[PDB]
Design a protein around this ligand. Structure first.
Ligand SMILES: *C(=O)CCCCCCCCCCCCCCC
Ligand SMILES: OC[C@H]1O[C@H](O)[C@@H](O)[C@@H](O)[C@@H]1O
Lengths: 517, 56
């Protein structure tokens, strides 16, 4: 039992031969607006109108391709459609188990006031979508951008399918509900079957439309997916502000959405051969946004005066930098970060045999400007030159302490918000120890440009292309943006690296060295 | 049978072809008591709207 330490006699031992100290370096950071981005393979899409006090108002639409579970179906003889219901499950969590079975749910990923209402319109798309197209000897991929709302809105056929005026909660006064949709069926020979379904978007579509579109359609149109997709191109979801009510936006997973058509046929009969009818059902599933490229998220934003002015090319200084950094998700903006000061002294750092203990970038949030608006829960830093994650991202294998919180992983890398006692954001710290180590260790390495942008999930590290690449400098381009950034509709304001910014809030790189002597 | 010749390049025997096709298989049917022997063509696959090129 002699494994205990003590604090007696520390002055008698000689001093070591290494000096642990930290250095501060300036950073060049400017704003770069994100123009129309690719919204074709987004795992989660936004549907609604979100009003942000600082950034502004953003309207999100969605277009998708429909598919049949089993092609070349046998609808039957003399089919009569009974109902056409579209169901899209909502992100919800059970909050209170109640008696008599049933449950109480709370909607998740809903942005905006809880009492918001929007005018939802579901139209039949008349614009054929493809996942890829042959080119001059090559098979190029098909990309749908966030600014193509006009193309899909002009090529829409008929009127909105959800035209049941008897239920205003599905049209003209739509609102994301949290009901449990209790259903009871005495089909158990007399016994009931109380079945409950989680909150979902249930809409009653025009029965007449589906009668001739599927139940009374030529067999040559529903024989395969290629012919069906050309016949039923897709569904277009349009949102507008309701009469005298605020608007809210929600993030949904349309991969689980489907429209079930319930009808009655004449049955296989031949035994009784009467005018009897049987109950049949056909399901028209929505294409998967990940396995198909026939889904686009039409995001339109009305940038505020302050946000538009800061990200404007006339108010951006690429030489000195910007005092305030406005980073917003979706078709918003990003920040270009260059460690020019560190590169200038990189020659002397490697000559003195200095070792890097840790490197970090601390982004301070502008609490005064960012007041009354929802703050992003995490930020992401990547390599803008190569459009790939930094070496520190791969080197960090830490998982969130909370069980089931996959969004809080890689806490060593950083990016998570540091809220104060007021429950408001205070700063974001990202560690780039591995990136700095490689620069000093490897002489052939080059200091690449770094991009800061809001992220929804740290796991999604893919990138989405821009319709038109931006020329940052003579031979520098801004062509892609992280896919997790487009999904996040929130944004944050941070202090820049300009020399005019106070040293206590200015953005600067802090490197902790082990100076051997 | 070449009904019409295209106005472009020709693919190699190992290149990808973007085309629409309708296939049928020939099967000689046995001569029944009332029906004489003949040939029948049964449909098996068809792609009216090509989406991805097929590697030859
Ligand atoms: C914490 O360190 C507690 C004391 C550790 C155990 C003490 C016993 C040590 C045994 C030594 C035996 C020496 C050899 C005996 C005969 C050759
Ligand atoms: O958790 C499901 C949902 O969570 C959030 C995002 O990470 C989405 O990409 C994902 O689909």
């Amino acid at each position: 039992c002699d494994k205990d330490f003590n604090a007696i006699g520390g002055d008698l031992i000689g001093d070591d031969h290494f000096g642990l100290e930290s250095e501060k370096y300036d950073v060049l950071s400017y704003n770069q607006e994100v123009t129309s981005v690719q919204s074709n393979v987004l795992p989660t899409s936004a549907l609604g109108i979100y009003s942000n006090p600082v950034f502004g108002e953003t309207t999100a639409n969605y277009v998708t391709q429909v598919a049949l579970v089993a092609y070349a179906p046998s609808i039957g003889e003399d089919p009569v459609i009974e109902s056409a219901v579209l169901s899209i499950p909502y992100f919800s969590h059970v909050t209170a188990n109640n008696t008599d079975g049933s449950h109480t749910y709370e909607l998740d990923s809903i942005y905006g006031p809880a009492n918001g209402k929007l005018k939802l319109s579901v139209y039949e798309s008349g614009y054929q979508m493809r996942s890829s197209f042959p080119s001059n000897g090559t098979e190029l991929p098909q990309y749908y951008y966030t600014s193509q709302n006009s193309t899909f809105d002009q090529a829409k056929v008929g009127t909105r399918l959800n035209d049941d005026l008897t239920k205003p909660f599905q049209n003209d006064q739509f609102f994301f509900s949290s009901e449990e949709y209790k259903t009871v069926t005495k089909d158990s020979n007399d016994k009931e079957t109380t079945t409950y379904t989680a909150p979902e978007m249930r809409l009653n579509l025009n029965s007449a439309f589906f009668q001739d579109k599927i139940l009374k359609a030529p067999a040559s149109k529903i024989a395969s997916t290629d012919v069906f997709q050309e016949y039923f191109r897709g569904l277009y979801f349009k949102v507008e502000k309701a009469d005298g009510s605020p608007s809210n936006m929600a993030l949904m997973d349309f991969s689980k959405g489907k429209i079930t058509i319930t009808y009655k046929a004449k049955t296989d009969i031949t035994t009784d051969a009467p005018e009897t009818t049987e109950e049949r059902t056909i399901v028209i599933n929505l294409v998967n946004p990940t396995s198909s490229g026939g889904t686009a998220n039409l995001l339109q934003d009305a940038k505020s005066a302050g946000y538009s002015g800061a990200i404007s090319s006339s108010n951006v200084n690429k030489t000195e930098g910007d005092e305030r950094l406005y980073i917003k998700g979706g078709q918003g903006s990003a920040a270009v970060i260059k460690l020019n000061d560190f590169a200038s002294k990189l020659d002397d750092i490697r000559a003195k045999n200095w070792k890097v203990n840790e490197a970090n970038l601390i982004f301070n949030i502008d609490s005064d400007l960012m007041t009354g608006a929802d703050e992003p829960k995490r930020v992401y830093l990547y390599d803008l030159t190569n459009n790939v994650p930094l070496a520190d991202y791969y080197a960090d294998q830490t998982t969130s302490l909370t069980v089931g919180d996959t969004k809080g992983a890689k806490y060593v890398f950083g990016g998570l918000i540091n809220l104060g006692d007021n429950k408001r954001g205070k700063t974001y710290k990202i560690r780039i120890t591995e990136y700095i180590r490689n620069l000093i260790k490897d002489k052939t390495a080059k200091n690449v440009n770094l991009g800061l942008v809001v992220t929804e999930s740290i796991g999604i590290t893919t990138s989405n292309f821009l319709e038109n690449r931006i020329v940052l400098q003579p031979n520098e381009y801004f062509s892609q943006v992280p896919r997790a950034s487009i999904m996040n509709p929130l944004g944050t304001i941070l202090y820049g690296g300009k020399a005019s910014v106070p040293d206590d809030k200015r953005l600067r790189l802090e490197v902790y060295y082990t100076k051997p002597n | 049978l070449v009904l019409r010749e295209g106005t472009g390049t020709s693919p190699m025997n190992t290149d990808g072809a973007f085309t629409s096709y309708r296939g049928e298989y020939l099967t000689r049917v046995a001569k029944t008591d009332t029906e004489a022997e003949h040939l029948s063509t049964t449909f098996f696959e068809q792609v009216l709207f090509p989406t991805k090129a097929l590697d030859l």
